[PDB]
Amino acid sequence: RKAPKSDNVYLKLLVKLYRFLARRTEAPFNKVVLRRLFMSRINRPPVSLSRIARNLKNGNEKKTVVVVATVTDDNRLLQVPKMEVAALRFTAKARARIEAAGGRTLTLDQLALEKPTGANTLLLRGPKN
Amino acid sequence: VQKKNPLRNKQIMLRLNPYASTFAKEKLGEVKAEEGKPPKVPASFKELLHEA
């Protein structure tokens, strides 16, 4: 669209960055990330550690998980695998459990610098309603 | 910025159609017909024309 509804200035910074990327690269990943950055909070539901742990199963354990939402901790998950996740926000228990398992935590600008086009990324959405 | 009529502006016509200069030079618009004595209309056609 024309403007994000968010008043977070850093969100608008991410929107400017991914507008530039979507314009100057032929990568559908950047366009999808920009579209999800424009979207509202109810349309960006929280993604739990267990849902990522399920999706990191076949050959995606070496891929970088990208979540345009907040990753939340799941108490049902007893063992957290090693994971490189790039998300808007992390809850304190989720970030602590990811880093305690040898994994890593990323923001979207570090993703845009390390992976400008989204090569070998795993885009994950949270459950609707 | 400004559409120019090729029928009024000869340079625009030469830009779109490079053949216009030699179409006008060789007079292909004033071409003459084939020479030789033309035959006369058949009488059958004339009697059909002025029938009853």
Binding site: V9, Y10, K12, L13 | -
Partner: protein, 134 residues
């Protein structure tokens, strides 16, 4: 954090801002190279900046601001004396503002030109009012 302070200045409040109803905003900051509130001309939201100012003595200086003194508000600007020769002053601006944005260089040359023209006009006006006595 140039962008973040720019968003805070531009979208919320700036004490140096003059909002006019005629289609342009103005910058009341003394170190603004053009007295206009826009992204390139902001002396605060740009960490590296350059302007041209004239002292009460009449000597015109070039003021340069870097990011490494940004936490030092008393040491923000370095002051370099510009020559009375106009072409040599233009080359001094070109030499000191090498590798700067072209907007800052262009506006610095324009401000130096306008300051020298104002000085010449002031001398002519002072001569005319001295002659007339009005």
């Amino acid at each position: 954090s140039d962008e973040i302070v720019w968003q805070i200045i531009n979208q919320q409040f700036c004490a140096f801002k003059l909002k006019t109803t005629k289609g342009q905003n103005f910058c009341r900051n003394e170190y603004s190279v053009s007295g206009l509130c826009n992204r390139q001309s902001c002396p605060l939201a740009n960490s590296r900046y350059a302007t041209v100012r004239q002292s009460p003595k009449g000597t015109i200086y070039l003021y340069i601001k870097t990011i490494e003194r940004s936490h030092m508000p008393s040491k923000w600007w370095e002051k370099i004396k510009l020559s009375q020769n106009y072409q040599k002053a233009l080359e001094q601006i070109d030499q000191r503002l090498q590798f700067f944005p072209k907007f800052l260089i262009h506006k610095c040359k324009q401000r130096l030109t306008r300051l020298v023209q104002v000085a010449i006009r002031m001398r002519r006006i002072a001569a005319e009012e001295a002659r007339l006595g009005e």
